Design a protein around this nucleic acid. Structure first.
Ligand SMILES: [K+]
Ligand SMILES: [K+]
Ligand SMILES: [K+]
Ligand SMILES: [K+]
Ligand SMILES: [K+]
Ligand SMILES: [K+]
Ligand SMILES: [K+]
Ligand SMILES: [K+]
Ligand SMILES: [Mg+2]
Ligand SMILES: [Mg+2]
Ligand SMILES: [Mg+2]
Ligand SMILES: [Mg+2]
Ligand SMILES: [Mg+2]
Ligand SMILES: [Mg+2]
Ligand SMILES: [Mg+2]
Ligand SMILES: [Mg+2]
Ligand SMILES: [Mg+2]
Ligand SMILES: [Mg+2]
Ligand SMILES: [Mg+2]
Ligand SMILES: [Mg+2]
Ligand SMILES: [Mg+2]
Ligand SMILES: [Mg+2]
Ligand SMILES: [Mg+2]
Ligand SMILES: [Mg+2]
Ligand SMILES: [Mg+2]
Ligand SMILES: [Mg+2]
Ligand SMILES: [Mg+2]
Ligand SMILES: [Mg+2]
Ligand SMILES: [Mg+2]
Ligand SMILES: [Mg+2]
Ligand SMILES: [Mg+2]
Ligand SMILES: [Mg+2]
Ligand SMILES: [Mg+2]
Ligand SMILES: [Mg+2]
Ligand SMILES: [Mg+2]
Ligand SMILES: [Mg+2]
Ligand SMILES: [Mg+2]
Ligand SMILES: [Mg+2]
Ligand SMILES: [Mg+2]
Ligand SMILES: [Mg+2]
Ligand SMILES: [Mg+2]
Ligand code: NA
Ligand code: NA
Ligand code: NA
Lengths: 128, 151, 114, 50, 104
RNA sequence: UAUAUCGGUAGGGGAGCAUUCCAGCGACGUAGAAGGGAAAAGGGCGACUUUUUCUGGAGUUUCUGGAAAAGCAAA
RNA sequence: UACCGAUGGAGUGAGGGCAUGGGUGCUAAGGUCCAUGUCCGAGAGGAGAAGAAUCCGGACCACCGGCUAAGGUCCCGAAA
RNA sequence: ACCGUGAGGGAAAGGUGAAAAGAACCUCGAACAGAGGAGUGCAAUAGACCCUGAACCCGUCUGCCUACAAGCGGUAGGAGCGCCAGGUGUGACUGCGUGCCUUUUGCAUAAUGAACCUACGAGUUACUGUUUGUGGCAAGGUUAAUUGUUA
């Protein structure tokens, strides 16, 4: 019964969090983290505009992740969000599994190429 | 557990007893006066002296242009410095310092007798040096200290 | 039989690494670097346990010197007079009286002021 | 005594000497061999009558 | 009123009801009574008595609370670099806890 | 009980801790084993040892004796 | 206070500085070869600004007690 | 598998759950790309690379400190601030301090060696001598190969 009780406690706790996750995005965690630091702490509609018009490639996926998080908030609160009500309360970028590749170099040498992936997590909340 | 139960107390910023004192340099030798001034700034005349706290007095020196240098040291003592460029060593004298102003000579001497750290860099800022007898430090009521009384 | 002490071998390192918390950079957690740093610190601690006694005696002497000069004497003259009169109060107690009980320090000085 | 409290006579069994296992034992590092030369090497043997 | 008294080779400033830690006293039990002569100075709230051959007729009476208290563990490390010599030991100083009951 | 002694490289001597398995004797475990995280306490001294809690979800351990694939910081 | 017998286990057999007596060298060398002591080697602590063997001194552990050594007592820096 | 003309050399790679009950259906999104739910299940932070899930390495949040300061990064003192009843985090400021190993007469050495972590890695066994601790018998001590019974 121990693990059942622990799981029930965690399941009750998750009901008050409003978040979305992107897992195994096949792109550089550092370059993704630049975008994350740009939009951390910002009101959601301005963040959507910023991500739509940003000059980084990763902003396109961050925008859809943010839309998913807002939808999760709307479903868990059983109402539509108003104007300027929600803001990006948490965002993080972690590194994920790396694909290893080999690239030929002069004089018969071979060098390793790393194709990196990341995870992104976004929590939204109200500006209370 | 703390098993000492009889400890030596360190003074701190709240419990230090700093005072403003005025000393006269009418006929004193430069190094001999500056050694005692350095003791005053450091706080070695305080029973609650604490080496890691600024616990000494604020010293106002008056009649600083009447300080005395014995021998031929007014022009014969050669101070050397370097600009950091090749061929960049420069010479100067206590006379050059005093012409620039008494406070520059006094600061140059007292630094050198102060500790060489952050505390000494702060402590040197508690020294005020004036050529005449006219200084504006009212509302602090500096007490007059006879420099010859200190040994 | 085959014996590999995996858990004990790892536990030794973990116990020592709990002691290197607070160090700078790799010196807190990288193990060869951390274990190197911790032993040099232990040699320092052995030396500094000896040096602490000298430091505190010097501090007491400086405070006694200042209080004696306030009373009119110097440290060397005051201590010579106390030793001649046979007063056995040590420098720690004398410095404590000088800092915190000036009347008691004054009475002590007045005892040997003759 | 039974099988649960067996005890050899005092001083009858002694632990073996184990070298090359750290500084506190007094037998690590060069492991009782000194520093260099023929006698320090693996496979050294004394030529009898030499 | 406070006094300066030598307890176990250490000079302490004591008052009534002060709960000292002193160097270990052997062969005592909790609640036992211990007297301490060798008073060097008596401050009777304004009047100061200084004793060169001790202050005559003064003492401090104490009660043992804890006959054995161990201090914090200290690591004792010896090492000589490039020589292989290294050793590490533990030390705990032993104390007795006393309470001052009367000051004479 | 006193006195004396207790810096150490090569190196000699003494006494111990942990690890895997075995015999005998005791024990523990789904009302929570081992392992992993955190915290506290202990040891002439130390190698190390206990205890509390979270994770974990099935095995573990005390003492006496026995046997070793019996301990890493640099090759 | 541990010198010899007999037995079990060794390591070492590249030494170095200083003082003294010498050879060699140029009465050169932080040179080299012997002798007699000593220290570093294998030795921490104090003074000398900082120094393997110069001056003082041989570290069982702890102490926020005291006396001294060499060397010091105007300030950095303990004490006239 | 891969490498080599060939003879030949020669890897890495185990674990969902008791049972597939292996997630109907909803939401964001072009898309399961991925996730949030619902449902199954003791448990899904057991969701297919699936038991446990350490280090190095990489992040986010909270507390404290930090833009006049200079050397192996610690160690011994010591305010202020912050948490939870004498504990715990940080550390203004002060004293002292040229890593470690190896090789050397002598190494901070500008001599050697290591990117880091986890895992792996080096006085073992047999026989025959010898000395010794502890034992059994004792003017004697001891069986080897092998044989019998039940095993
Ligand atoms: K070694
Ligand atoms: K096991
Ligand atoms: K020689
Ligand atoms: K599972
Ligand atoms: K299972
Ligand atoms: K993990
Ligand atoms: K520091
Ligand atoms: K080289
Ligand atoms: Mg890519
Ligand atoms: Mg673009
Ligand atoms: Mg080619
Ligand atoms: Mg001393
Ligand atoms: Mg040895
Ligand atoms: Mg040899
Ligand atoms: Mg070697
Ligand atoms: Mg050799
Ligand atoms: Mg070979
Ligand atoms: Mg000794
Ligand atoms: Mg020894
Ligand atoms: Mg549990
Ligand atoms: Mg092994
Ligand atoms: Mg290992
Ligand atoms: Mg030879
Ligand atoms: Mg030779
Ligand atoms: Mg020579
Ligand atoms: Mg050698
Ligand atoms: Mg010697
Ligand atoms: Mg003296
Ligand atoms: Mg001084
Ligand atoms: Mg696609
Ligand atoms: Mg889990
Ligand atoms: Mg798992
Ligand atoms: Mg400046
Ligand atoms: Mg600043
Ligand atoms: Mg050489
Ligand atoms: Mg050196
Ligand atoms: Mg070489
Ligand atoms: Mg290298
Ligand atoms: Mg190196
Ligand atoms: Mg290494
Ligand atoms: Mg390695
Ligand atoms: Na031994
Ligand atoms: Na799903
Ligand atoms: Na390398």
């Amino acid at each position: 019964a121990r693990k059942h009780n622990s799981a029930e406690a965690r399941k009750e706790a998750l009901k008050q969090m409003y978040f979305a996750k992107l897992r195994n995005v096949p792109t550089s965690p550092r370059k993704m983290r630049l975008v994350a630091d740009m939009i951390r702490g910002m009101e959601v509609n301005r963040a959507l505009g910023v991500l739509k018009f940003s000059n980084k490639e990763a902003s396109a996926r961050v925008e859809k992740l943010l839309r998913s998080a807002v939808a999760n908030w709307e479903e868990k609160n059983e109402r539509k969000a108003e104007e300027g009500e929600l803001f990006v309360s948490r965002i993080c970028v972690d590194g994920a599994s790396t694909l290893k590749r080999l690239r030929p170099a002069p004089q018969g040498r071979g060098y390793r190429i790393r194709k990196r992936s990341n995870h992104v997590t976004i929590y939204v909340d109200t500006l209370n | 557990m703390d098993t000492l139960s009889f400890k030596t107390i360190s003074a701190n910023k709240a419990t230090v007893t700093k005072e403003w004192v005025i000393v006269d340099a009418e006929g004193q030798t430069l190094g001999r006066m500056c050694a005692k001034v350095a003791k005053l700034l450091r706080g070695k005349y305080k029973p609650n002296f604490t080496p890691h706290v600024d616990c000494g007095d604020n010293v106002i020196v008056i009649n600083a242009d009447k300080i005395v240098l014995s021998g031929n040291k007014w022009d014969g003592r050669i101070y050397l410095r370097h600009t950091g460029y090749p061929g960049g060593q420069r010479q100067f004298t206590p006379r050059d310092f005093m012409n620039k102003g008494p406070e520059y000579l006094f600061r140059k001497v007292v630094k050198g007798m102060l500790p060489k750290n952050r505390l000494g860099a702060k402590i040197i800022g508690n020294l005020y040096v004036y050529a005449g007898t006219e200084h504006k430090h009212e509302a602090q009521q500096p007490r007059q200290l006879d420099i010859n009384s200190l040994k | 039989p085959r014996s590999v002490n995996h858990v004990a071998s790892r536990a030794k390192r973990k116990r020592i690494l709990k002691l290197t918390r607070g160090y700078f950079g790799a010196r807190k957690n990288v193990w060869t670097v951390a274990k190197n740093t911790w032993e040099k610190g232990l040699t320092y601690a052995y030396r500094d346990r000896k040096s602490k006694k000298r430091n505190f005696r010097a501090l007491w002497i400086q405070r006694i010197n200042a209080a004696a000069r306030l009373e009119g004497m110097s440290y060397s003259r005051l201590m010579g007079a106390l030793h001649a009169n046979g007063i056995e109060i040590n420098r720690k107690v004398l410095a404590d009286l000088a800092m915190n009980h000036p009347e008691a320090f004054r009475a002590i000085v007045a005892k040997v002021k003759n | 005594m039974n099988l649960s409290s067996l005890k050899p006579a005092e001083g009858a069994v002694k632990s073996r000497k184990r070298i090359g296992r750290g500084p506190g034992s007094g037998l690590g590092g060069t492991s009782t061999r000194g520093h260099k030369g023929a006698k320090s090497r693996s496979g050294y043997s004394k030529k009898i009558g030499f | 009123m406070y006094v300066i008294v030598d307890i176990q080779g250490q000079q302490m400033k004591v008052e009534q009801g002060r709960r000292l830690f002193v160097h270990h006293i052997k062969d005592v039990e909790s609640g036992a009574s211990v007297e301490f002569d060798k008073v060097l100075l008596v401050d009777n709230n304004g009047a100061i008595t200084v004793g060169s051959p001790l202050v005559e007729g003064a003492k401090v009476v104490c009660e043992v609370l804890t006959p054995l208290v161990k201090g914090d563990k200290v690591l004792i490390f010896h090492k000589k670099r490039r020589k292989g010599y290294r050793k590490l030991n533990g030390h705990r100083q032993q104390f007795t806890e006393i309470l001052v009951k009367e000051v004479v």
